Amino acid sequence: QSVTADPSPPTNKLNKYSSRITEPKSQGGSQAILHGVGLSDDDLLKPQIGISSVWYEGNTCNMHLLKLSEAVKEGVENAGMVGFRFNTIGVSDAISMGTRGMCFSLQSRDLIADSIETVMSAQWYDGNISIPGCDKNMPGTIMAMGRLNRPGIMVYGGTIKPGFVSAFQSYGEFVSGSISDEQRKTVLGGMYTANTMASAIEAMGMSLPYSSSIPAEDPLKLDECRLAGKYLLELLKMDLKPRDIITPKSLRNAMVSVMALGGSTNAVLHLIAIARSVGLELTLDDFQKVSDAVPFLADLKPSGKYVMEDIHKIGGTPAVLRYLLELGLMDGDCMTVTGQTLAQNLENVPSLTEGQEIIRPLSNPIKETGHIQILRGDLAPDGSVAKITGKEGLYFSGPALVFEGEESMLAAISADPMSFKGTVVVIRGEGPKGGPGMPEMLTPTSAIMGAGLGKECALLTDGRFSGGSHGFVVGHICPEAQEGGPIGLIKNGDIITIDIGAARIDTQVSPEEMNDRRKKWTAPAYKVNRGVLYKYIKNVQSASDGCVTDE
Amino acid sequence: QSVTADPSPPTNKLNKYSSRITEPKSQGGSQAILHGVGLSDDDLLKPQIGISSVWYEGNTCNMHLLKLSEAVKEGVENAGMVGFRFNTIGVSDAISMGTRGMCFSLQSRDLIADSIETVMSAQWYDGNISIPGCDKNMPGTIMAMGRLNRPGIMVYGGTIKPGFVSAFQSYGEFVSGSISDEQRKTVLGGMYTANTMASAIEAMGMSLPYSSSIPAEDPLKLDECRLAGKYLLELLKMDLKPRDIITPKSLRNAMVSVMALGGSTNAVLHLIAIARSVGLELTLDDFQKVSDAVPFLADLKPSGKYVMEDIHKIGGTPAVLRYLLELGLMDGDCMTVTGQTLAQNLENVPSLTEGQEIIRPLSNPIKETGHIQILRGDLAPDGSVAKITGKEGLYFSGPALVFEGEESMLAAISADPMSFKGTVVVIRGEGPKGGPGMPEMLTPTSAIMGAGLGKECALLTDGRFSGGSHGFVVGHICPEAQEGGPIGLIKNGDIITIDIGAARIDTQVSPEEMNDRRKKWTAPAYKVNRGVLYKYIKNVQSASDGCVTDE
Ligand code: FES
Ligand code: FES
C-alpha cells in the first residue's frame, strides 16, 4: 500500500536527503547552521545519520543509553559520515504498574514513532540508528523507520543481567504471611515484552546479529554500537531500505521467533503496528497460523527457568535462529541490515552449545503448537489474545463477575475472595479508549494466585494482563466495552464458556437478549477531555488493528 | 474550565505525587527500580523533579542543553530533592526553512507538550524544570505544565550571541548581483519567535528573572540552572502551581511584553495554546485590545537595530518589565515562580541604564499602538494576523494573483516578476490542514523584495510568513483554504482591498457569487494519509484557536 507521510528525496548518491539542504545555494541558511554545529565544507558532502536514543534517568532500562549513543556517533564518524544525536521520551512500566500512570504506557510507542519521524523529516537526515532500551519502546522506532523508508538500524540497549517481578511479588507474599517485612525489603530479564520484541526485531532483520541477546552493559554492546555506522554506510550504498527488509516473509520470521521463544502477547499489537507502517497487512488469524505451525521449544522465564543471559551463553539469538532455520521454520532469503540475507548471516554463527537445556529439540518441545491463541465467539466477535501453555485444559465455564475497572476488582477479592471461586472475572473498561491507553494489569493475576484461586477462576478484559494465573487469562477483547462491544453488555451471573478447542468465548445469554441490552446501552463519558490521552482516544484503532493511531 | 487530563495526587507534603510509588507497600516493584537507579531509603522521602531538556545536536539553539540539564540536576540535589533528567525531540526552522520539512515545525510544539505530559504522569514526578532552546519549542513545555498543574519552572536556554537571516539573504543578493559567491560563502538573535516567547513567558511569571535576556553560554545561565531547584523547592512548599501563575492578568502581561517589544505574530498562536492548557480563554480580539493599549517602544531587530544581548547590557528583561510596570501597563500583583509577585521581583532590579537608546520613552514611541493587527472581512471572516509598523499606509487594493502553494508562487515571480506589480498575491493551501502543519514561509517576502516589489504588492496566506515586505503581509487567514474558507474561492483578477483602519480584507466579488463558488467547491485530497502529519490533520483546530490538537 502507498504510504504517503514523509518528504521524498530531491540516485547512486549516499546523501539523497541531506543534499536537499547541503547542496542548493537557496539553502544557504541551512548550511550556516550546519557550519555552526561544526560541519566543514567537506562535511557537507557526507551522509547525515540521525541517532535517536530513548535515554532518561528514571529507569534502569534507559539510564545508560547516552553512553551507547556516544559510541554510535563515533562509529558513524569512523565510517566517514556525520552523526546527529537526538533523544525522545519513554516511560517505565515497572514504575507505573498498578497506578493510573499505566494509561500513558502503550501510547508512548506511537509518540516515539511520531518523534523520530518528526526529526528525521525536518532535518533531512539520510539514515537512522535507533537505540531503545530494555523497556517497551522498541516497536516505536521500527514504526518510524517504516514511515520514512530510509536506511536504518535498531541497536537494542541490552537486557539487564539478573540481580522486578520478584519485587512486585513481595507485597503479596508479605500480606499472605510467607515473608516478613525485612525479607520484603531485601528483595527490593526473561521473555517479557522487551526481550520478545528485541528478539523478534532481530529475526525480522532490522537489528544486527546478537543485538537482542548481548546484555546491557556488556563490552560487546559498545562494540556493536561502534559498528552500526559501518553497516549503515553499506545500507546507503545498496539503498537497502526498511520496506526492502520488512516483508511478509520477514514478518513471519519475527512471528516464528515469538512462538518458539514463548514471547509476550504484546508482540501481537507491536508486530501488527510495524506491518502497517510499511503498508502491509497482518491480522490475528496470521498469528494463529504461525502459532499452529511453530512449537514452543524455549525453556525461558516467565514460562521456564532461564533468562536472556543464558541464551547469550549458549550462543545468543543467532544460534536460536540458526536452529529454527535448519528445522525449516524460517525463510532465510530475507535481506537484513547486514547487507546479506538471514541464511548468509546464520551460516557462520556458532550453533547452540552441546548439552544445552534451554532450547528443546523438535522431538521434545514444551508445547507442540504456539503459546498464542486467538479466541473469538459471542463475547469477542472481533478477536482476543491469550497465552496458553497447554496444561490448563480446553474448557472453563462459570458465572460472570463483572468489574468496571481494576480498582473495584481488587477491592472485592480483598474483601471477599471466596465469591470469586468458580467465576469468570470480567474487568472491562480498560481498552484503548475506555482505559484510556489500554493499561497492562499485573495485580489481578497476582491477587487471584495469592488467594489460592489460580485454577479455580477465569480472567477476561478488553485491556491487557501481564502474567498468567495457571488458568484462562484473556485480553485484547474486541470490541472494547467503551465501544459497545458484547463485553460491555455482560451482567453478573451470565454463564461464560471459554472453549480453547473451538477458540470461542461464548455466553449462555441468547443473542436476542444480547441485542436487547445493546439497544439500551449508552457509552460512558470519556475519563479525560484534554491532553495526550484525549488525542489517543480520538485516534487509536482497535486492539485487533494493533492500536495504530495514524489511519 | 475543568481540565481533566492527568492523574490526581493520592496536603503539606512536598512529594504529593511521588509518594504514590515511594510510600505504599503495594508499589514494591516501583521502589526496586528506584533503588536500581541509585535512590536510597532516605531518598524515597524526598520530592522527585522531572528535568525535561530539548537537546539535540542538529541545531545551534539546542546543542548545549545537556550541559544546562546537568547543572539543573545538581541544583535540584543541592536543594535536597531527587532529579530525573529526560529529553524530548525538537526541530530547527533555520534548517528546514524553504523545504517540505517545515510542515513538521509547528506540530512539534504539541508533540513536546504530549511528551513531557507523558513522562511526568507515568513516573509520578512532583515538579518539573524544563530547558527549551532558542528555537520555537518553549510554548510546548508551558502547555505541558498547564495540563499537569504541578509546580514547574521554565529555564530558557538563552539566545546565541551575534556572529541566520543574513545567511538566508545571501542567495537573493547573489542572484540579484549585489554580492559574489565568495562574499556569500563568508556570510555562511533579535525579536523573533524564540526571543518573543522567552520574554513573554518571563513576563508571564513562569521563568525566573533575567532568564530570557541572559545569553546562551553566559556563565550566569549555568548559575540560573543551579538555582532552579531552590526556587522549585519553595514552590512545592507553597504549592504554587502553574494555574495559580497563569491567570487572565498574567496572560495580559505576556501580551503587553509582545506589543512593547514588537514580538512575532507566532506569539498569537502560542499564547492562545498556553491559555487553553489551563482552562482559560484567549481570543484574537483580546490581542487587538492589548495592541491598541500598549505602544511599541523597543528598537530591536527585525524592526529595529539592536538584539537581545543589547537588552542584557542595559538591564535585561526585568529592567524592561520594570519600565512597563511603572507606566501602569502591567499588573504587578501576579504571582511568579520566585514565590513573590511581579512587582516584588521588579522593585529591586536595576532600572534601564541611563542614556539607553533601545527602549523608547512613552513620549516618543516607535508606534503609538501595537504592531499586531487583527484583520477580518469577507476573505478572513474568522480572523487573520498581520504585523503593522504604521509606515505602510492604511489601504491596498489590487487584482488577485492566486497560487496553490509556495512552490508555484516562487516559479512565477522568478519567470515573470512584473506580472506581480500591483497585485494581491494569495498563497493558499498552507494552513494547518492544507499545508499540512501550517508552514512558515520566508522566501515569498524575500523574493518580492529582491524583485523590487516591496511596496508594490500585498501578500495573503492561510499559513505563516516570517518577515515583512515593507507592505501588507497577512497570515493565519481563517478559515483555511482546505476547510473551504473564502480564501479557497478567490480567482485570479478578483479585486481584493485591505483596510487597516476598518481591519478588513474584502473582495469586490458579490457575496452571492462567493456563495455560488462555495456550492461548487470540493475539498482537495489530503497531501498525506499516514504518519504524524496525518494525525495533525485529524486533530488540529483553526489558527484563531491557536492550532490546539487536544480538544
Ligand atoms: S520498565 Fe523496562 S521492562 Fe518494564
Ligand atoms: S532553528 Fe532555532 S530559532 Fe530557528
Author numbering:
A (entry chain A), B (entry chain A): 3 to 12, 16 to 168, 177 to 201, 212 to 574
The authors write:
Dihydroxy acid dehydratase (DHAD) is the third enzyme in the plant branched-chain amino acid biosynthetic pathway and the target for commercial herbicide development. We have previously reported the discovery of fungal natural product aspterric acid (AA) as a submicromolar inhibitor of DHAD through self-resistance gene directed genome mining. Our structural and kinetic analysis of the mutant AthDHADs has validated the hypothesis that larger hydrophobic amino acids surrounding the active-site entrance enhance resistance to AA.
To determine if small-to-large amino acid mutations at these hydrophobic residues can decrease active site volume and increase resistance to AA, we generated multiple mutations at V496, V497, and I177 in AthDHAD followed by kinetic and structural characterizations. To probe the acquired resistance mechanism of AthDHAD mutants, we determined the crystal of AthDHAD–I177F (2.45 Å), AthDHAD–V178W (1.77 Å), AthDHAD–V496W (1.59 Å), and AthDHAD–V497F (1.87 Å). In the crystal structures of I177F, V178W, V496W, and V497F, the occupancy of [2Fe–2S] cluster is 0.64, 0.72, 0.63, and 0.77, respectively. The overall structures of the AthDHAD mutants I177F, V178W, V496W, and V497F displayed high similarity with the wild-type AthDHAD, with the RMSD of 0.123 Å (888 core Cα atoms), 0.275 Å (994 core Cα atoms), 0.142 Å (1,034 core Cα atoms), and 0.283 Å (994 core Cα atoms), respectively. As a result, this mutant also affects the accession of AA to the active site. Both V178 and I177 are close to the active site.
